[model samples]
Target: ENSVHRYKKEASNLIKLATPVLIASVAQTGMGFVDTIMAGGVSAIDMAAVSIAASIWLPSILFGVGLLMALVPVVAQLNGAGRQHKIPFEVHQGLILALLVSVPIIAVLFQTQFIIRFMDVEEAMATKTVGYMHAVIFAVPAYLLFQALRSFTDGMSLTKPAMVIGFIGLLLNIPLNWIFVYGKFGAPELGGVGCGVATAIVYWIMLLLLLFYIVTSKRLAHVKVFETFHKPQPKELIRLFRLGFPVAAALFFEVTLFAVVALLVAPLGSTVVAAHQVALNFSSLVFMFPMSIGAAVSIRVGHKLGEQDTKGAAIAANVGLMTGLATACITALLTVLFREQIALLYTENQVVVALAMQLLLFAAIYQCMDAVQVVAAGSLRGYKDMTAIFHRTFISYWVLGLPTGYILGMTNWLTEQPLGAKGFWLGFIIGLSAAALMLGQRLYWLQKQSDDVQLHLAAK
Candidate 1:
């Protein structure tokens, strides 16, 4: 079991599960890219405005995503344990939870103007961003529902549906954006705000497609996710929250750092905002690959854990972490090499291009650590140990990272050099690096504790 064959075997399993997820993740990233491109094409003000609103939208939505993510590993474990009969119940509860969470999110989106005001963004730009959020609010339910349904399919180890649905959504998005952005097909010219409606439409389409797939697919016949209507079960909902809320909070912690950074960078001018947005968007695209690998490892690890094969779980995690880090190295290299070309694709503005190219350097530097941390965190989720993540991320990102960036970006400290946006990116690198080390150590410690429990059980 300790041989090279074991490593090779686990690697194959991880890759098999990872490939479709990678495709789906790429498609999801492409959704944002399309919006950025369409918005950027119209004007820098539009692009910057969209970027401002997106910081809020992305975090709010991702919190729900992280909440729904609790179901995926549990589904994998249940399936592996031959408890598939309960999946429908679990999924239904998650669906209810999804609907419940959407309210506060949209409410927050509606208040975008109030939120941005505190950040001191320009008035005209803030107004456009508010309009963008209003358009986005229409799709919240569908987006969260999509994530809820996705947990079921993903739990069952049928990821191709997600990939297919993602591509379909992306395909529909381009045309929709064009029609709205340019006022074609009887649609009004909404500029950057159009991107929001376009995204919402895509989300609804994806939700319906996945729901249909669940109802009709022969593979899901056993699940019967929609077969019976069960009333909201408090016990089940509570259990989901217990498992998911930490994930949601951790995601908020991670994402809000970026969101606040965007906010802080807003007053700098449209050029800085556009450059940051471009760099961040492209970095997100690179991020999806490792994120996919981490998600796949979670499924594998959960399945093995349910089978009471801790060694197999450990092997799966190791393979996933190493693979993600390897992929990170390659992507980071490519990003560094092609930073200029990549920046230029988003806009013709040389000021933004030059600034984004410099920011891309920081993106390259941080990505490896970011990849490793995601894998570590994903493995922990598989293990159903999440408390540490919320704590660790808060400490690293808020307690240390933001302050360091604020000082370096806004004040003359640590060598009398306030470095502007680059300071924030540098701060981000430090935070993620800290998280990787801390999470890695926690994983190793957990493995040791797991070994002890196994030994104790064997002796009995």
Candidate 2:
């Protein structure tokens, strides 16, 4: 009974730690949902354009965000090890590296339309997508800067400030979207381009607000470097890159797999593409909760590891996995039940709704696998075993996931079957299942290794 109480208390503590992260993620998802809803209201073509353009940019943005993720674990470890003085310097190094890497990518993507034209979309669709892509590209640096700030704050267990700033950014987005999309308040009506412009503005605003909070807040003043800016060292930049590149690669692999899936679905016609977008968008929103839990777990587990408490780290990770699984299962059930209604929110086309419903079934099952894989991956990040995660993600997403999805979605054998969209969804199930199995096994082995080491040391 005492042991049960102990477990319960630990679980509660984990939830308390995770709640702010969960709220932050959900707020971020809301921004995406707002963009989707606003774009969808303009026209199906507009919605489709936003979807296509977003698919192209998703990998790049994920890569940048992934680079920032490196900060959290390292910072958490430093905090746990009582190396407080090092935190600001490491953060500055991460910022410098992130900027150096981001500049080249942003320059390339800013003119990405030349590359996007090669995709097999219609001329008009391609043109609109390119327009939106161009507008959003300018915001990349700002967005990455926001990631830098958010990651540093989150790493230190101070997520509320970031969350509040993000919400403020979202508030600003609504009016900006209305203005730019419809030419309201003396702004040019850019339609789909308006979504991109509004998003870009929001990104900059979020970063500026975060910077202000960090500089002015009494709480963060203890960090030495916040007092002034200094040139970063080459060695620090290399170390930051070493920690960040694997995370970026892992993100790129997964996002690129999904983007490819989107492209493959496009040739089936606009309805199919739109249906897939609806389902994917909703699934992404649902993913926020578990992803936040995973992030919180990573911080807590990393802290425990740094403190040399192997048992506590493992328990923290397990608590996160359990929370993710439980939340995902409930959401999966709700999605399955309300899929049609949810589809209606995105498109009024009956065929699209039906197709979306069929796909939602697959998404429902995939959520279970996604929950495990994401949480396990987060646990691995906590242990700073990012190199292994990069390899696993590449193999799972590129080697297994993308190929399966492409074959199922494009080949006559699967396409000719009655399954249609179900075939596409099945690909997701298979890929995520493989990913979940591998990641879960890896996490288990890591925890086992930690436990064994602790036990041996205890016996000594």
Candidate 3:
């Protein structure tokens, strides 16, 4: 009976946790897909430039996003430990930290054109990419603020609010893209630059909507921090930074690994780079679901741990891992079944389609491993074991993945071996697998350690 009840409870908890995350993931994909569609209609060159700019900017943005990840675990732990009042203070601290970190990023991105020139891309592509990058930079503050709000809301397990606001923002992006991209409604035809402007507008709208919800909604009225704005506390800021730094570094390492792949593919000629971008964009779309599950699992597991429901926490982690695997399997099958059709959606060039198909095959192979690593990392985050997770990601992505990809994708002997893009995918599989294994083992060991300590204390 106990076992039966345990399974039932776990299933219910998993659904409750995964639903908002799934919605959030879908909304995120909607925004990207809409941007791609509008930009792709302009020209393949424009599409390719946007992709490159995205690859470059996303890592920096994710670093700031990762800082907000600290909120979920900290809040979950507080809630689980029956100390709900502490959550508001943590949320306030998170907001202050996010703003401080985001300002410099915004400043740097304003000079994104110079950075693109530094990269030595083709003259035309560099100009287009920088244009998009600069336009998007204006929204950094709003986007980062939205992230902070999302973390606070999600920490309280009120993810539906963020998901709903995100969808509304995504909806706004489409018309804005259409109007700006084509000069409709008396707007200037900004072409690919229009996509960036529309996205920036969406970010601001989302931030405003989220703020409205937080202020007016009765569900979150209990969180005292939202009642009034207070001056930033330096000591609290330092604490938040200390807690969030590992998370930021871990995310930066992971995002930069892929960005480096894009940079390496650039010199392979425009066609190869374009095809690689298509494959990567599609894979990233699929990845958002698993990433969402990882976020949900982190929150749920942290909540359970805070409540001292050790078994429940373990089950939450396992459920997340299972869900991730399921998503990977589905995506893998679809990629295999419709590889050519999927490639065709991105470009008309036959050569690009052929190259993209090969990359998709490699993507399919690694999706499962990527799922494993992402969820494992999330579960560890729930445990607030970010320090170790950060080191492991650095070692896995840089020491292991990056070098392997460089050797296989760039070295004369290996590049001559007929693998091409497959080599990079192989490196991804190896690195993610290593990360998943290490993280999983670490989570298990920590759980066991906690159980032993509890038992010893009970014996007293």
Candidate 4:
């Protein structure tokens, strides 16, 4: 009874921390939903154009997101250890890192026409896709800088700021899309490409808003994040990058799996590709719930570890898994119950709706294992156990998932008929299940270690 009570209390705390993260995640993802809905209204061709453009853009941006994710746990541990003074320098390095990485990413995005051409995209679709890429690529630095600052706040257990800012961004996105996508307010009608322009504008505004908030908000004033300028320190940058690169690579592997699926399905036809995007985007939105909880898990676990409370850290990890699973159950149920209605929200086309409806069932099954995998991964991050994560994702997503998806989706190896996009989703389910099992095993192993060694491992 006492243990149950304790666990319940921990669950409450975890939820409190996770709720804002969930909202922020939802709001950010809602922008994608907005893009899909608004662009679909323009035409299926426009929707497909945004989908392909986004597939390429998402993988690249997630790499930078993973790199900055290192900051969350680092800052949390430092704060818990009473080394709060070091946080500004760490955050500064992260900002510098964000800016440095942005240059190459922008350069690559500018020439997306090459990739589009290689993919043999329809000429009209290719033009819109390239335009969207060019516009959104400018948002990269702003988004990364915002992420760097947001990590600082999240690590300090201040989760509301990002949530507020994200809502503002979403609101801004709607009107901006209205003006640019439909050419209202005398703006040029850019079709799907307008989503890119609007997104870039919103992202810069988000970054500046966050910066101003950090400067003036009483909650963050003590951090003095911008009080002094930080020049790039080569050694520090290298060290942080080394610590963060595996994180970036792991995320790259994971997201690119989806990106690859989108690209592969492109030649299948516009209707097929649009249906896939509808299902994928919605699934991505639901996924934010677990992903947010995982982030909270990292924050809580980091704090516990820094306090040298191995038992508490283990409890936090377990509680996080429990909470994530519970949340997933609800989301999955909602997805299953509303599959048809939800698909209709994305498009009016009966063909796209039917295909998307079937895919949502696969997505619902995907939620549970994905929740477990991401939450377990988050716990490992708290311990700074990253290399194993990279290796695990590589094995599961690339070595196992992608191949399985390819065989079932593209070939008749397992069935009399190829399963198409549904097969790839099944592959995702398998990969996430494997990832959950492996990551859980790792967390268990880490829990068994002696406190002294665990602390040594985290710090080292």
Candidate 1 residues lying further than 4 Å off, grouped into runs, are 35-75, 110-155, 179-189, 225-233, 261-279, 343-346, 349-359, 387-394, 405-412, 415-424, 448-460
Error of 2 at 302 (Å): 1.5
Q: How far out, in Å, is residue 107 in model 2?
A: 1.8
Q: Between candidates 1 and 4, which one is better according to lDDT?
A: 4
Would you estimate the TM-scores of all the predictions? 0.79, 0.79, 0.80, 0.80
Q: Local distance difference test, per candidate?
A: 0.60, 0.58, 0.58, 0.60
Candidate numbers, best TM-score first, in rank order: 4, 3, 2, 1
* Top-lDDT candidate index: 4
Residue 123 alpha-carbon offset, candidate 1, angstroms: 9.3
**lDDT digits (tens) for residues 1-460 of candidate 3:** 5547655766676667577667766665677666644563344455445444554464355444445445323444556646666666666655555556555565555455445545443334434543554445434444544444443335455566656656786788777767765547876544445555675676567667656665555554655444334454434444344445556656665566566665665565665644465557777777766777776766666666656556754577667776678888888777786777777765665656666677777777577777888776755443454544545554665567656765656553364657545565466567777776767766655565466334223210
TM accuracy, model 3? 0.80
| lDDT (10s digit) by residue, model 2, range 61-174 | 645444544543344556654554466665555555555655556555545545555555433443454355444544554444444444434435555554565577667777
Q: Model 1, residue 62: what's the lDDT?
A: 49
Which portions of model 2 show Cα errors greater than 4 Å?
A: 1-10, 33-74, 114-155, 180-189, 218-220, 226-236, 265-278, 352-355, 401-420, 444-460
Tell me how far the alpha carbon of residue 294 in candidate 4 is from the true structure, in angstroms, after superposition: 0.7
Q: Residue 243's C-alpha lDDT in candidate 2?
A: 49
Give, for candidate 2, the lowest lDDT window spanning 10 residues. 451-460
* Residues 49-132, model 4: lDDT tens digits: 545455446445645454544543354566665665576666666665565666556555555544554444433453544355
Worst 10 residues of 1 by lDDT: 451-460
